[PDB]
Amino acid sequence: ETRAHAEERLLKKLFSGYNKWSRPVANISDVVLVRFGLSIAQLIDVDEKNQMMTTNVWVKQEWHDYKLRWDPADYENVTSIRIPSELIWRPDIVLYNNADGDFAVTHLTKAHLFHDGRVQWTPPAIYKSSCSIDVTFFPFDQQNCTMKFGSWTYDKAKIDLVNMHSRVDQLDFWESGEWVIVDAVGTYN
């Protein structure tokens, strides 16, 4: 009756025969559609001399797992749960143009899992990426630093990326006092 017992029963049922090393699609021809977005927490540093940009972002990911499904009516109307993201399959989205940092997400927060198989995973990440610096009009210069994200080992026929939103989310942005973000748009390639 209690919610904790129902949640324990659900967790036991879900991970009974779950394989985290297998792409979670019922049919091999199916594509794992991963909705990808960014949210910039702050622009820590733009290093003109070293031509690196350091950003604090939240990597917002959302996909569907066909094995992590349940009917809430059988589990005391439990509609979603938080599970460690290291227990389940995740896409291997990495930053291509990394420089002096980590290629992949390393924090591995909990993933929000919904009764219909939807998984929302929004880990944070400090990225140090390379960008060419144009100092023709310094100190009146405007820089254009890019971040390239994509899966490392799954081609378009297996994992496909979708722009959650055109513009990088800046609701929780920490204004720096040295730079202003004129535009921050993600382009699918």
Binding site: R3, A4, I44, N56, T109, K110
Partner: protein, 202 residues
């Protein structure tokens, strides 16, 4: 002590305690987490990078109804230390940090009372970004804030509340370069979100 080993094995028995489940029953009730930052030392304030480094204890308290026992059956034992990695924790982190270090530094043991009250006091070294006001330098007073949230659970699952309205200086070592004036704490909701809650210290 054999009694303490027996109690620790009984409490954390996997057949009856799962740390992946939030201790909230009878519907998705709220787990109220009391927060109290105690400032051990103000390590530094690097003005050029606008980063303040502090050494604090992130005192946290909540109630876990699954970690109760009868003291009479365990030699009148009214408290026990349990490894924090083996019990459900409210993943309260520093959101406004720079350098991307969110969690506590050590993950010390949690002190469990026989009534299910958890008292966790982990040390943390935090590098928090703050806005430097250079107008009156070198006679300047800075207002650097530390924002604390749970990066796992929202206001509908855990409620963050302030144990006291000011950060504690009970174990503070004066910095020698910066002087503490005030360390108030405030609990912030969002009138139009209903899933946002944070505790900020100025």
């Amino acid at each position: 002590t054999d009694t303490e080993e027996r109690l620790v094995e009984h409490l954390l028995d996997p057949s009856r305690y799962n740390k992946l489940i939030r201790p909230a029953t009878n519907g998705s009730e709220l787990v109220t987490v009391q927060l109290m930052v105690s400032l051990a030392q103000l390590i530094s304030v690097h003005e050029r990078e606008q980063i303040m480094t502090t050494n604090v204890w992130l005192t946290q308290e909540w109630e876990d109804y699954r970690l109760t026992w009868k003291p009479e059956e365990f030699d009148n034992m009214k408290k026990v230390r349990l490894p924090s990695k083996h019990i459900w924790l409210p993943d309260v982190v520093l959101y406004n940090n720079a350098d991307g270090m969110y969690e506590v530094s050590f993950y010390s043991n949690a002190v469990v009372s026989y009534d299910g009250s958890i008292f966790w006091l982990p040390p943390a070294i935090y590098k928090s970004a703050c806005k430097i006001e250079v107008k009156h330098f070198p006679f300047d007073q800075q207002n650097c804030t530390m924002k604390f949230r749970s990066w796992t659970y929202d206001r509908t699952e855990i409620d963050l509340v302030l144990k006291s309205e000011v950060a504690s200086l009970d174990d503070f070592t004066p910095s020698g370069e910066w002087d503490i004036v005030a360390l108030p704490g405030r609990r912030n909701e969002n009138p139009d979100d209903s899933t946002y809650v944070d505790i900020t210290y100025d």
